[PDB]
Design a protein around this ligand. Structure first.
Ligand SMILES: N[C@@H](CCC(=O)O)C(=O)O
Ligand code: NA
Ligand code: NA
Length: 299
């Protein structure tokens, strides 16, 4: 029996990393019963997580809902990898807006203003960069459309923005998170909206992109709500992982749901029924289905 699982997440100042930590705590507290030990890995993000589940070095991964769909189908960012039809959904979680964090004197007031600036578009292997490519397609942009197209991982973007190495960085991430808190607090960075006909087309044409709002007061300096588009964070796995393992992880979260929603402020408004279906477009792992049917959440 498999007795040790690893969850791939993201940069340590994001939301994926403490999300993994919360899931592993709920799994580990009953390790004397199901003999499952859970550990968390900081990684490059959604794209690395899918590819590393597939290569066998991760058992679970947290993945944006758009790259759950495209990783399973082998399309868009995953086109050269081919389909991965063993990928399975477990549950979805918080919303992740497409955030733009800019210097106060950058002149960047909307997403269209990113062209011709020094923009961190994201590290290879992050959902940040893969979804930024969707934005670039809607605008007809490539890397040369920016003065500089930097590829820093999440934990390094705020320090680069404060050092005046970039004018802005993007981040597909839930709220609040430590990366954006640092930039807005310590460097007077501003959260910039992404609206206009290009964003409207992105939302209208895809079921996994929906309008998003970050409320005023989430960060110091951003005194009005910030509109954009967002995806859902989802936990995925492979059908190679045993039904018993996925069943016990799913049960650990859903049977301790009131505890889970107290472990990070991004989980405060999660709803069990939505976690089964929302943002999940590929088959659910049989172990998760088994729990959901016991709990009355399915059929
Ligand atoms: N959605 C981001 C990660 C955000 C986070 O770390 O919370 C990515 O896939 O790269
Ligand atoms: Na949509
Ligand atoms: Na769905």
């Amino acid at each position: 029996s498999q007795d040790f699982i690893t969850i791939g997440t993201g940069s340590v100042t994001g939301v994926y990393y403490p999300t993994g930590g919360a899931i592993c705590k709920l799994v580990n507290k009953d390790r004397k019963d199901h003999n499952i030990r859970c550990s968390v890995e900081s990684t490059g993000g959604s794209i690395y997580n899918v590819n590393t589940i597939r290569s066998g070095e991760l058992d679970f991964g947290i993945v944006q809902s758009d790259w759950q769909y495209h990783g399973y189908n082998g399309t868009s960012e995953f086109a050269e990898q081919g389909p991965y039809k063993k990928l399975r959904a477990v549950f979805s979680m918080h919303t992740e807006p497409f955030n733009i964090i800019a210097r106060a004197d950058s002149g960047i007031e909307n997403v269209k203003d990113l062209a011709g600036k020094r923009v961190n578009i994201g590290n290879p292997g992050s959902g940040d960069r893969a979804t930024m490519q969707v934005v670039m397609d809607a605008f007809g942009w490539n890397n040369d459309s920016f003065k500089l197209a930097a590829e820093l991982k999440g934990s390094e973007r705020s320090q680069a923005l404060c050092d005046n190495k970039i004018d802005a960085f993007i981040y597909m991430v839930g709220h609040p998170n430590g990366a954006i808190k640092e930039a807005t607090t310590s460097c007077a960075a501003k959260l910039v909206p992404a609206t206009g006909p290009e964003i409207e087309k992105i939302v209208a044409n895809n079921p996994y992109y929906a309008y998003s709002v970050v409320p005023a007061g989430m960060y110091s300096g951003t005194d009005q709500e910030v509109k954009s588009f967002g995806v859902a964070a989802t936990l995925v796995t492979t059908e190679e992982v045993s039904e018993a393992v996925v069943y016990n992880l799913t049960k650990a979260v859903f049977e301790n749901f009131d505890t889970f929603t107290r472990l990070h402020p991004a989980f405060a408004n999660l709803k069990k029924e939505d976690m089964v279906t929302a943002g999940n477009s590929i088959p659910l792992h049989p172990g998760a289905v088994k729990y959901y049917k016991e709990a009355g959440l399915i059929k």
